[PDB]
Structure formats: structure tokens, C-alpha cells
Amino acid sequence: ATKVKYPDGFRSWYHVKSMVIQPGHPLENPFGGIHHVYANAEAIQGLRGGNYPDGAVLVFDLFDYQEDNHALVEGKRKLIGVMERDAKRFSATGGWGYEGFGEGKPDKRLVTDGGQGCFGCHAAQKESQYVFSRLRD
Amino acid sequence: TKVKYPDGFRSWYHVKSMVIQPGHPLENPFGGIHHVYANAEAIQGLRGGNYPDGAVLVFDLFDYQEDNHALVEGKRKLIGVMERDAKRFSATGGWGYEGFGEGKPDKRLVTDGGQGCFGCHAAQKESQYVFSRLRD
Ligand code: HEC
Ligand code: HEC
Ligand SMILES: [Zn+2]
Ligand SMILES: [Zn+2]
Structure with a gap:
């Protein structure tokens, strides 16, 4: 593809x-x-101490929050x-393809530079x- | 009569x-x-069916450090x-309530048959x- 696939059904994957x-941390923008x-499944293999198979996907899902x-x-x-893991396709950025979707929407792709910045x-x-990320119990 | 420890719960749907945080009404025990x-069965009830027997919901509580x-x-x-079971847990509205200290099966926390919960x-x-309500 060259492009990273939108990870359909990521919400049913392993948390x-x-x-x-919070405000004041160095990464308040853009990761607040x-x-x-x-x-x-493929990402878990790599997380466990296996190698990462092609097809492994990790997702960062970012929510605003409210104090209540x-x-x-x-x-x-x-x-x-x-x-998204593909040793051959994403060799330029270390075997992982990087993408952002604005508001988690499939159309609102954010990355403009092949993922160099990421x-x-x-x-x-x-x-x-x-x-x-490290696996915890 | 007792709530089963939910083996494998970490592989369930989040x-x-x-x-x-400190100061909230629920600070102990739930801070x-x-x-x-x-x-799977609890997802049916969450998306708007009846909760079938065998539905299990889990509140997984970690401490945090502010850094x-x-x-x-x-x-x-x-x-x-x-744990959903309309027959066995009739006295607490068809849900059985239990707390596991540190998430260990030996460390049962409830001593009043779930009445407090x-x-x-x-x-x-x-x-x-x-x-809890389902969100996207
Ligand atoms: C540092 C200035 C970062 C930039 C730029 C990007 N990311 Fe990253 N990412 C960073 C951190 C510190 C973490 C860990 C957060 C935690 O809770 O431990 C992450 C995590 C991810 C993940 C999850 C997998 C992992 O590596 O732990 C993904 C999928 C991810 N980041 C993607 C991503 C993308 C697509 C970026 C550019 C749009 C990007 N990151 C930039 C730090 C930094
Ligand atoms: C009063 C306040 C209580 C008491 C005494 C207990 N809980 Fe329950 N609980 C409460 C709230 C406000 C929430 C929602 C948290 C959120 O929205 O993130 C919960 C949640 C749970 C859950 C998750 C399922 C659900 O949303 O109903 C479980 C499994 C749960 N609580 C169990 C539980 C047990 C075993 C209790 C007694 C040991 C108990 N709770 C007490 C509020 C309250
Ligand atoms: Zn206050
Ligand atoms: Zn602070």
C-alpha cells in the first residue's frame, strides 16, 4: 500500500x-x-519477547478528559x-509504518512525511x- | 454461592x-x-440486551504515581x-459481587454476601x- 491501514475493530483487541x-508534562502537546x-495478536507475540510478525499493529488511542x-x-x-509492522514496506522507518487518524476517523489521516517525525x-x-509500551499483568 | 475468580479477564473487551484521585467520595476503596x-456475554447486556447468566464485569484498579x-x-x-446469575444471586439483584485483593484468587474482600456493593x-x-456504558 505504502499507507498504513486503518485498524478496524482495534477496540476489541488486547488492552x-x-x-x-496532564498540563505541565513536556508532552502536553500533542499527547495530552x-x-x-x-x-x-501478532503484536502480542512481539510484546511477549517474541519477534514482531508482519501484520502486527499497535494503537495509541487518545482521549481528552474532564475533571469532575x-x-x-x-x-x-x-x-x-x-x-503497522512490515519489515519490507516500512524499512525507511524501521519496519513500522506510522499514521495518525484525527478523532479516530479513517478519512482524517494526519501524517504528511512518510512518518519520519513519528x-x-x-x-x-x-x-x-x-x-x-511494555506488557504488564 | 461464591463468585468465581474471572480467569483470563485481561484478554476481555476494554x-x-x-x-x-484523593478527595473523591469513592477514594477508598476505589482510588x-x-x-x-x-x-462476551456482558457485552450483550451493554449493547442493550438482557444480561445472560454467565455475564462477568471486572473493575481492575491500579495505584498510580504522579511524575x-x-x-x-x-x-x-x-x-x-x-457475575450474572439470576438464580444464585437473587438476593443481590441477580449479580454476585466479589473483591480480589491485588487481583489474587485467595484474597476475597467481601464479607457481607455483597450487600454493601x-x-x-x-x-x-x-x-x-x-x-458503565459502552463508548466508541
Ligand atoms: C515522542 C516525542 C513521540 C512522537 C513524536 C511520537 N510518539 Fe509514539 N509514543 C511515544 C511514547 C512516549 C509512547 C508511549 C506511551 C505509553 O503509554 O507508554 C508512544 C507510544 C506509541 C504507540 C503505542 C506503542 C508503543 O510504542 O508503546 C503508538 C502506536 C504510537 N506511539 C504511534 C505514534 C505515531 C503514529 C506517531 C506520529 C504521528 C507517534 N507515535 C509520534 C512517543 C512519541
Ligand atoms: C457506591 C459508590 C459503590 C459501591 C459501594 C461499589 N461500587 Fe461498583 N461501581 C461504582 C461506580 C460509580 C462504578 C462505575 C465506575 C465507572 O464508571 O468507571 C462502579 C463500577 C463497578 C464495576 C464495573 C461495572 C459497572 O460499571 O457497574 C464492578 C464490576 C463493580 N463496580 C463491582 C463492585 C464490587 C464488587 C463492589 C463491592 C466490593 C462494588 N462495586 C461497590 C460504585 C460503587
Ligand atoms: Zn475537593
Ligand atoms: Zn499534577
Whole structure:
């Protein structure tokens, strides 16, 4: 394709982890909100300490939140980030293709530079195949 | 008579999450970052059917650490469990309530047959005693 596929049905995949990024954290833009990480079956193989098969997809699902009496509550989806494994097609950015969908909508693709900008930051995790998230129990 | 420990619950569908911080009314026992998981049968009730027997919902509660204005997940504090069985759990509206300390099967937390859990969940009689709603 050259392009990353919209990950249909990502919401029924394995929930890896969540984190909250609030105002004042260095990454308030653009990663401010509650985010959840999801992984398909092939991605779990790579997360477990296996290698990542082609077809492995990880999803960053980012929500705005609202403060409600000492509770942070999920608001609207801001975007999904998608990493799709293909050693051959996405060799230019380390075997992963990078894409963002605005509000998680399939038409609102965000990345304009082949994912160089995305890769630039993930290149730090060379040791773990460009993935920050770690599996927890 | 007892709620079964929900083996494999971490591979279930993630319904939603929420953060309860110090000061919230529910701070104990429920303070922390929590995620709600549902088995296949519980998804039927969530998308608007009746909840069939065998439906299980799970409240998975982690501590968090605040680090330069990020909330990072720490250790699992407990899980809350609702298990649907109209016959066995008639006394608590057809749901069995149980708490597992640290998410370990040995550490049962409920000592009043679920009455305490049931008293608050009863506000949501209209939606079969469930607070969580499905979101996209
Ligand atoms: C640093 C300045 C980043 C840039 C630019 C991008 N991402 Fe990244 N990403 C970053 C972090 C710190 C994390 C981990 C968050 C956590 O909760 O641990 C992530 C995570 C992802 C993931 C999930 C898988 C993983 O590597 O943990 C995906 C799918 C992802 N990011 C995609 C992505 C895309 C598409 C980006 C450009 C549009 C992008 N990221 C930029 C840090 C940084
Ligand atoms: C009053 C306040 C209570 C009490 C005493 C208990 N819970 Fe229940 N609970 C409450 C709320 C407001 C929520 C919703 C959280 C959210 O929207 O993110 C929940 C949720 C659960 C869930 C998830 C399913 C659901 O949304 O109904 C479970 C499985 C659950 N709670 C279990 C549970 C158990 C076992 C309790 C006694 C040990 C218990 N709860 C008490 C509010 C309240
Ligand atoms: Zn207050
Ligand atoms: Zn803070």
C-alpha cells in the first residue's frame, strides 16, 4: 500500500496499558489526555519477547478528559496513532509504518512525511523494536 | 454461592477507564486508575440486551504515581467482580459481587454476601445495576 491501514475493530483487541498526560508534562502537546494502548495478536507475540510478525499493529488511542470532583473522566477521542509492522514496506522507518487518524476517523489521516517525525522519537527504543509500551499483568 | 475468580479477564473487551484521585467520595476503596472489562456475554447486556447468566464485569484498579504531571500505572490494588446469575444471586439483584485483593484468587474482600456493593449499585436498577456504558 505504502499507507498504513486503518485498524478496524482495534477496540476489541488486547488492552496493553494506559497513561495520563496532564498540563505541565513536556508532552502536553500533542499527547495530552488519557491514552490506552491496544495490540493485535501478532503484536502480542512481539510484546511477549517474541519477534514482531508482519501484520502486527499497535494503537495509541487518545482521549481528552474532564475533571469532575477529583475524578478524571474520558471525554472525546482526539486521535489514534497506529504502528503497522512490515519489515519490507516500512524499512525507511524501521519496519513500522506510522499514521495518525484525527478523532479516530479513517478519512482524517494526519501524517504528511512518510512518518519520519513519528519515527524520530521512537528511534530511541531501537533496543525494543521501536516500541515504548511494555506488557504488564 | 461464591463468585468465581474471572480467569483470563485481561484478554476481555476494554469497556472504559476512569481515574479517581484523593478527595473523591469513592477514594477508598476505589482510588486509583481503573479499567472496566466485560466478557462476551456482558457485552450483550451493554449493547442493550438482557444480561445472560454467565455475564462477568471486572473493575481492575491500579495505584498510580504522579511524575511531572503524568499519571503512570503502578501496582494492581484489587479487582471488583460482578457475575450474572439470576438464580444464585437473587438476593443481590441477580449479580454476585466479589473483591480480589491485588487481583489474587485467595484474597476475597467481601464479607457481607455483597450487600454493601449491592446497596450502591441499586441506584442503577434501570440499567440492570451497571454504571458503565459502552463508548466508541
Ligand atoms: C515522542 C516525542 C513521540 C512522537 C513524536 C511520537 N510518539 Fe509514539 N509514543 C511515544 C511514547 C512516549 C509512547 C508511549 C506511551 C505509553 O503509554 O507508554 C508512544 C507510544 C506509541 C504507540 C503505542 C506503542 C508503543 O510504542 O508503546 C503508538 C502506536 C504510537 N506511539 C504511534 C505514534 C505515531 C503514529 C506517531 C506520529 C504521528 C507517534 N507515535 C509520534 C512517543 C512519541
Ligand atoms: C457506591 C459508590 C459503590 C459501591 C459501594 C461499589 N461500587 Fe461498583 N461501581 C461504582 C461506580 C460509580 C462504578 C462505575 C465506575 C465507572 O464508571 O468507571 C462502579 C463500577 C463497578 C464495576 C464495573 C461495572 C459497572 O460499571 O457497574 C464492578 C464490576 C463493580 N463496580 C463491582 C463492585 C464490587 C464488587 C463492589 C463491592 C466490593 C462494588 N462495586 C461497590 C460504585 C460503587
Ligand atoms: Zn475537593
Ligand atoms: Zn499534577
